[PDB]
Design a protein around this ligand. Structure first.
Ligand code: 5X4
Length: 288
């Protein structure tokens, strides 16, 4: 158990401008200007004692991660509403993005999102972190060519995690987790499988028209999400393996990287889609 020497940066509130509300749990668009640095960083600003301790837990995890497919923490601002400041992801969450652009999303984009998400998750596994809330809504889009995993509030650091009775997304959850509140990197792989299904259906809702309470018995009887129309058996077999009952039968993220990478070199063999064929601004990824 190695010492976590990550730096937590406190930001002066006078160092940034809130341009606009992005969504609302409120997120703002903004510009961070470290004083006398002559850079402007576009940022997202996520703005009760319980609220404060939970948001500081998230800041803790986000400050201990540094990977190109993991969300970046720039710093915090100490106010009574205690803001998280991160890199601005100008295209929003990936689930809204596939819903909005489904008629122009080709197989190349789909398979490389799958690669990049697997890279993010494999990195979180290397740092012994279990995300516990992986879903297309929690993947942000920096560019159509570059996505990052976000939302580490539920994440817990480590062989298994025994949780309490807080509210949980049953439809993205492994079955061990629904029944026994157990979470592992392999229960994260299950959520990855639902995530890929979300993408391949262009953002359909898993088990739509079913309440969370029946899900556990459905999965016990052997039922799974259907094969998306665009999906070859090759791709759909990968989802199904992510949904094995035996968690060590599920793929590892490093294996998922390899498989989707192979498929990304010939994407039309694996997905069938009709028609597939401010001067001082600095991106946060370049401000080190
Ligand atoms: C699926 C919901 C969605 O589109 N979101 C999530 C919540 C609202 C913000 C939306 N948005 C952003 N977000 C971010 O840039 C961002 C960065 C880091 C962390 C977070 C988080 F998780 F805390 F919320 C958000 N950027 C844009 C740009 C344009 C449009 C939208 C809607 C947008 C994304």
């Amino acid at each position: 158990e190695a010492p976590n020497q990550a730096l937590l940066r406190i930001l002066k509130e006078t160092e940034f401008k809130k341009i606009k509300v992005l969504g609302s749990g409120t997120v703002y668009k903004g510009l961070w200007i470290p004083e006398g640095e002559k850079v402007k960083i576009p940022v997202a600003i996520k703005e009760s004692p319980k609220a404060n301790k939970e948001i500081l837990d998230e800041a803790y995890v986000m400050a201990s991660v540094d990977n190109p497919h993991v969300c970046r923490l720039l710093g915090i601002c100490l106010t009574s509403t205690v803001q998280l400041i991160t890199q601005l992801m100008p295209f929003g969450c990936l689930l809204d993005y596939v819903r909005e652009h489904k008629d122009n999303i080709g197989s190349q984009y789909l398979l490389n999102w799958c690669v990049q998400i697997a890279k993010g998750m494999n990195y979180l596994e290397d740092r012994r972190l279990v995300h516990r809330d992986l879903a297309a809504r929690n993947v942000l889009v920096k560019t159509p060519q570059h996505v990052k995993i976000t939302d580490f509030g539920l994440a817990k650091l480590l062989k298994e995690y025994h949780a309490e009775g807080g509210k949980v997304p049953i439809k993205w959850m492994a079955l061990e987790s629904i029944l026994h509140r157990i979470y592992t990197h392999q229960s994260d792989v299950w959520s990855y499988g639902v995530t890929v299904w979300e993408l391949m259906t262009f953002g359909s809702k898993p088990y739509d028209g079913i309440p969370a309470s029946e899900i556990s018995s459905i999965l016990e009887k052997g039922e799974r999400l259907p094969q998306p129309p665009i999906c070859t058996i090759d791709v759909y077999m990968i989802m199904v393996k992510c949904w094995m009952i035996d968690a060590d039968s599920r793929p590892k993220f490093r294996e998922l990287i390899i498989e989707f990478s192979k498929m990304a070199r010939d994407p039309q063999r694996y997905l069938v889609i009709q028609g597939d064929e401010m001067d001082d601004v600095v991106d946060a990824d370049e401000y080190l």
